[PDB]
Design a protein around this ligand. Structure first.
Ligand code: NA
Ligand code: NA
Ligand code: NA
Lengths: 239, 218, 239, 239
């Protein structure tokens, strides 16, 4: 016959070997595929789609869960007050957990790219005022006050003029490896921070509510990517 | 849109179980450590009716031998599968010189080795096998007998002069290949009674299919 | 030698693997094939051949079996009466079981296409009258009367004018999967119905029989197909 | 390495597999073949060579064995008498067993073609007369008399005019399969018959013997063939 030598690895079954195997029904002709709208070909498409960011991940009371989808701004607040704050950490526990992006990061080990967060003011039309949205790069600590926050990267948002505004997180990278307890994780450290401050007070005329809500939508930019598949979940098929 | 699954080759593909040879240690059955299985495609229940949808057929066959003990256990035993082609004398004893006749192709294999497999050609001296023959070979008991359909015989046995230490079983699977058929005919609708003829139970003649109460009530 | 690695599946025997095996008689030269008339190459050819449809699958008495091959029409019947009815279900138990088409469907799991049923009036030449043959698509229920049946797809057949008439079942599809008892079957639901009604009464002159028979022939159309081979039968080779 | 899957048949030893095996003496150079006269390349060559047909396979007495090689014709015989008779059955027991053709048929299972039998009269030169050699095709029964034999295929042989004459058996075919006792043979049935009759009486002058012998030689024609090798013999190497 033809001379051969079996090499190590012979007979092994590697769960990730993508070889070819004998067809059970060789004559079977699968019904043909037709066109179905909305095919997805790469998860990154979904990652780029904005979903609601539960910045207000505070109430746990079952009947208040819907409140996590929006945070408020009110007349009561005084100019300069810190409104809300959160970090740009898609893969870690927190607000991003509500985003489809955060959820998908959970199926991977490493990732990086730019992010985008859009804030939608849903108060009355008659309501006006200014908010200062600021990004503090990684390492930098939450600004003591509005004043110092203003010295950094920021946007003065006049919800009297425009109802939405989008902030861009230039770069996040979950690559630095850690080996804490005895469980080795691949965590950020690249936690940039987004702080929202009242620049002016909430201004409203007679007859307009004194509290309005902001909805935050977020997604990854086109330069975003993920590596090392990692199946993990608390939600698994039941017995 | 495709029609490959309804081709004759598709309809007759697959390796079916056509034979089972029992080689017990103690027993009434095959007491000489050998057995002669004349090739019968009818071994697979379902086959008879299918091939009989046609009058004339032509094909090859791939035979696969799956052997083990009655518990499916694998044992260190050497076997001999000898194909004695039509016209050749079959062995009559574990010591017949037939087992040694070169013109009877034999495959020697271990029960540990994977199944043995060989191909048997269209053997008939006629242009095609034929399931029906309205005539007598040159009231009678020879009616309908087409002899020129003999495919041959497989003589199975453990190797050696002394009886095997183990109780064995050899299952014979047959895959028809390169199938051709002619003259289709009505599909058998009455149960079979004898391997060699179309005789049907005249007392129990049943309707081709199911019945109902009235022709106006579904 | 030449480096090789045996992969899973090595040594297995798959009853449906269509590989190649060593020839037992390498020098043997099979007698040559000659030309035999009537070669069949695809079962679908047989499926398209009309065979008798036992619409009248009622009598079981051995000596009356031949009666299942034909149903009657008679003087006695009054205009409008329902004559016979059956469903377009080639693969299921019933009248189609007599047809070669129905029998072949039994060797497969799924199928679809158009069907054709030809009705042949075999009464006297002197006999005349009209029958209304109607097809009620799947879902639709057997028409209450001739009147409503007429509102649907139908053919007014004058057996005075033409002795045969053919109805076309536009489409049947045995694809919907079922899992009833504990045995999973692939059944229709696409049971369209064919109902035959007396449009006029049976008219005949003195000397002509008052009962005539109709023979029904059926077959699948050219757009018919079958999938998933399934060997099944009650008629098996005996011990 | 290179991915492989061992298939059924692996490790088997098929006595008729004509594969290739490792050479024991790779450097050995076999003495070269020279030209030897009389090479045979296909047994059919030998089959076409005439050998003596023991039509007279009667005497068994050791010292009379040579008599089987020839049958006689004599003065004593009367016009019309049946001289000898034999069937055209190369592969079966009988006269052909003496022929090399018959012997070779014994190494095969099936065969067919035309045959040829040459009769050589070896009587005196002064002897004269006529013989009627007749062939009765398969099925046909030995002719009752010369008269009827003459109605069929025949040759009037005048051994006064020509000393040899050749008859051609148009066709014999040992293909019909049989399963008698419990031993399945592939026998003829195509036994055509060759009958030899005295047309005239043996005529001789004073001084010439009253008995002469005919030698029969036979062989297969060029359209002859054999199938299915079958080693069989009573003459085997001794212990
Ligand atoms: Na390797
Ligand atoms: Na193989
Ligand atoms: Na070899």
């Amino acid at each position: 016959g033809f001379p051969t030598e079996l090499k190590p690895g012979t007979n092994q079954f590697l769960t990730t070997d993508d070889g070819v195997s004998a067809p059970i029904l060789p004559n079977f002709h699968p019904t043909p595929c037709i066109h179905i709208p909305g095919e997805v070909r790469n998860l990154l498409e979904l990652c780029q789609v904005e979903t609601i960011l539960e910045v207000n991940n505070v109430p746990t009371n079952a009947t208040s869960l819907m409140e996590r989808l929006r945070f408020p701004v009110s007349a009561q607040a005084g100019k300069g007050e810190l409104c809300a704050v959160f970090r740009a950490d898609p893969g870690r526990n927190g607000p991003w957990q509500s985003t489809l992006l955060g959820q998908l990061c959970g199926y991977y080990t490493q990732w990086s790219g730019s992010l985008e967060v859009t804030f939608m003011f849903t108060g009355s039309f008659m309501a006006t005022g200014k908010m200062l949205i600021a990004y503090t790069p990684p390492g930098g600590p939450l600004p003591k006050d509005r004043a110092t926050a203003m010295l950094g990267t920021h946007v003065i948002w006049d919800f009297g003029l425009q109802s939405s505004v989008t902030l861009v997180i230039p770069w996040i990278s979950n690559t630095h490896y850690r080996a804490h307890a005895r469980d080795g994780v691949f965590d950020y450290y690249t936690t940039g921070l987004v702080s929202i401050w009242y620049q002016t007070n909430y201004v409203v005329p007679i007859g307009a509510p004194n509290t309005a809500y902001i909805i935050a939508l977020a997604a990854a930019q086109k330069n975003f990517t993920m590596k090392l598949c990692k199946d993990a979940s608390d939600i698994l098929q039941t017995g | 849109h495709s029609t490959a699954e309804t081709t004759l080759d598709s309809f007759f593909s697959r390796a079916g179980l056509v034979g089972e040879i029992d080689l017990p240690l103690k027993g009434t059955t095959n007491p000489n450590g050998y057995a002669n299985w004349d090739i019968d495609i009818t071994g697979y229940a379902q086959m008879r009716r299918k091939v009989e949808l046609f009058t004339y057929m032509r094909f090859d066959a791939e035979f696969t031998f799956v052997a083990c003990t009655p518990t499916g256990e694998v044992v260190p035993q050497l076997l001999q599968y000898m194909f004695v082609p039509p016209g050749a004398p079959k062995p009559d004893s574990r010591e017949s010189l037939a087992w040694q006749t070169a013109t009877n192709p034999s495959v020697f294999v271990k029960l540990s080795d994977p199944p043995a497999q060989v191909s048997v050609p269209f053997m008939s001296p006629a242009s095609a096998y034929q399931w029906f023959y309205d005539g007598y070979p040159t009231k009678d008991l020879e009616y309908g007998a087409m002899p020129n359909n003999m495919m041959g015989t497989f003589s199975v046995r453990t190797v050696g002069t002394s009886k095997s230490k183990y109780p064995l079983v050899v299952r014979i699977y047959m895959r028809m290949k390169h199938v051709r058929a002619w003259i289709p005919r009505p599909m058998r609708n009455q149960n079979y009674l004898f391997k060699a003829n179309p005789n049907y139970a005249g007392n129990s003649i049943k309707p081709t299919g199911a019945s109902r109460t009235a022709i106006t009530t579904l």
